[PDB]
Swiss-Prot record, chains A, B:
This is ATP phosphoribosyltransferase. It comes from Psychrobacter arcticus (strain DSM 17307 / VKM B-2377 / 273-4). The gene is hisG. GO terms for cellular component: cytoplasm. Heteromultimer composed of HisG and HisZ subunits. The keyword Lipoprotein does not apply.
Length: 209, 209
């Protein structure tokens, strides 16, 4: 396959990327959410799509298994973005990285334990607050952890805050805003620029409105 | 909450644990697969259930946020089981850890790159084969990696082999058999033994047939 391979993930990222792809002459030929297929063709024979877990998008792009991708800033910060280029803030799937805990619960007088998927982000953020913290690495359902005493706080992505509120948690601190970003493999950017450039230009034009 | 907190995960583990719980006088009052609730009551007021991602079950049990749990051997090997007790092989959700790659594809003459969620298991298994390997940490859909050149092999859990076969992959090596195990927090085992013992005994009796 001599074309470009685009790494996306399911849900909001796929949903909100598709219009940008449509304006650039790229359309999926079926709903990937309903398929066992791993690699998907498009209306453009020079572009194919991978549907990955959000956390794996930087990995595939870094290694060149995908030439470019759409990854949330949260994933990029946690994974590390030193071995891809971030070309565009696409302003999609916007949310916040935040700390949260049980509503009105006092912080303990000791090293805090932070339950999170975002272990690197958590250590860095708390370091900026003057705190060395213990981190408990979790893979999902962060909202449960404070309820059963696993960790004093969580770090997670928050959009509406409804999950938090439904579970008797409240956001404590805003860490940073998060949006999905167009990343490119550093070799693909050089070797396949003629294929990338018009797509990149279309995306840039689309995001300007 | 003074009772026991049991950590389970969705799908086959939940499905196949429920009969064992039923024989021990513990029944869920609704289908957790259909609910936003995080902690679930049971027919026994001394037992509640957490529905976690499989990878997080050892974590919750180790820290004492759950007193006991059902975790796959694959997760235990990868996480490390030094800070829980493994009491029972429940013989449920049986499968194999295996290596796999593209059907009939020759191995490269260099350090192999292993794409997997099971980074620790992969390094240990290949070390037993006389090989130092590079590992690429992935979070899902392992079957894709060899198709797009990410890694030379994968390590994954295989049951039927259908996913592998559907994607033009074949299992290369059998690493070990995997089944779900009853694990207990090391303090809970001492402090709450009177609550645990009859449940543990029931499970043992059930698995004997």
């Amino acid at each position: 396959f001599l074309g470009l391979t685009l790494a996306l993930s399911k849900g909001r990222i796929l949903e909100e990327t598709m219009p940008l792809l449509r304006a650039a002459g790229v359309e999926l030929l079926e709903d990937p959410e309903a398929s066992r297929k791993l690699i998907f063709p498009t209306s453009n024979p020079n572009v194919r799509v991978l549907i990955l877990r959000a956390s794996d998008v930087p990995t595939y792009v870094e290694h060149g298994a995908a030439d470019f991708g759409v990854a949330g800033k949260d994933v990029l910060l946690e994974h590390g973005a030193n071995h891809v280029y971030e070309l565009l803030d696409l302003k999609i799937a916007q949310c916040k990285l935040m700390t949260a805990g049980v509503k009105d619960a006092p912080l303990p007088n000791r090293r805090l334990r932070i339950a999170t998927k975002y272990v690197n982000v958590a250590r860095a953020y708390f370091a900026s607050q003057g705190q060395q913290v213990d981190v408990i690495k979790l893979y999902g359902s962060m909202e449960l952890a404070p309820l059963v005493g696993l960790g004093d706080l969580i770090v997670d992505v928050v959009d509406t805050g409804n999950t938090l509120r439904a579970n008797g948690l409240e956001a404590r601190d805003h860490i940073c805003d998060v949006s999905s970003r167009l990343i490119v493999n550093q070799v693909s950017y050089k070797r396949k620029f003629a294929l990338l450039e018009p797509i990149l230009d279309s995306f840039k034009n689309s995001i300007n409105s």
